[PDB]
Symmetry: D2
Subunit: 123 residues, 4 copies
């Protein structure tokens, strides 16, 4: 049902766009939306660190700038193509758009977002 090799690959591609001059730590993400399209995002840092955009947040922006809908699955990777768990902020924003059933690429098996952010605030 979810081609994880494809999603992960798109996340790996997407990582290539990261604007990460401060950390040099590129992140890409790719998500499958409920209509079968995939949207991607990369890391975008800012001199004011707290204004940096996460790749998974970029994905959510793409989601809504391309017709919205629900996220079914997301892979997040570093610039080396390694699977990354989304930061807590991203877990919260993904939840809004995929709910607890959103699959997040690996550990050794994609995880439900619900398990990555249990007892989530607040709707």
């Amino acid at each position: 049902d979810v081609d994880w090799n494809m999603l992960r690959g798109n996340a790996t591609q997407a990582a290539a766009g990261a604007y990460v001059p401060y950390s040099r730590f590129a992140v890409g993400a790719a998500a499958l939306v409920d209509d079968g399209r995939v949207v991607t995002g990369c890391n975008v840092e800012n001199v004011s660190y707290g204004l940096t955009l996460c790749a998974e947040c970029a994905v959510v922006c793409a989601l809504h700038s391309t017709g919205g809908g629900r996220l079914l699955a997301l892979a997040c990777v570093d610039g080396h193509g390694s699977v990354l768990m989304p930061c807590g902020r991203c877990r919260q924003v993904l939840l809004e758009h995929g709910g607890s059933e959103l699959l997040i690429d690996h550990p050794v098996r994609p995880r439900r977002l619900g398990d990555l952010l249990p007892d989530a605030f607040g709707l």
Copy 2:
């Protein structure tokens, strides 16, 4: 040189994608990048308000997820198609990607970002 009617129109289109169930205040943005392509973004709210994504930040994500480069001009509008000045956070993130010379759609004449965020922190 900059088709502002086009950019503003794209920002107006882009506003249609806003996920704004909390504020009901849709924002769209569209920017011209140095290679002539235009990238767009809309507002994406979250139950945790501080995780909401600005449309202009969505634009910057699109920028880098589509090859990066420099932003030359940006229009930001509300869901009514009215010109909006970017919030301070967006002014900072746009600066990273357009610098002080980035034109921002209107007042009655597009403004340099440099004038919208004078004496900007911090590079």
Copy 3:
């Protein structure tokens, strides 16, 4: 070892300071730091929603503006004094300052942050 009734009460007090004109949803937090002092925080909203400050983030700011150290326990509550789980963003920021062993007030028993943000990004 942790007076949860005290922490929760301080979180309830702290909620009273929330600047929440947009959501009307007050949040307070109080944390015990490794030296036995307690630091508190409340929700601070902004017209640009994504600039709203979480109460638990306020706590972390207090932590470092009062000598830093490690967070041992945190209660987060709404304006009604109900226990709230921190949003994903707060779970990530708390982790930086309390690690996985940081106790977070309730469900029916305080939880390790590690369990609230399993397999956390990224250090």
Copy 4:
């Protein structure tokens, strides 16, 4: 009316608390509130860069966790005690709490926030 030497000094003190292991770029802030008390804040970074808290945002949290009110004047400094202009995000959050008349320490003369964030979004 505003003891800027005092505010700047408090901002310099406050900078000492910064949690800045990623950038090593400490920021402190101190603000005078309408009741004459001063509240302070420092920079707090996170591994997820975009979750870093600005010192001026820390100030606003202190403001409301200490009774709220309006900010009259703010100095922001780096770890070297040099005057810093607030990032765009901070200019927006300060505006909510000080309005356009909030004085911001230097260039060679404190500036109105209104001039640092002209034509501000959006209330």
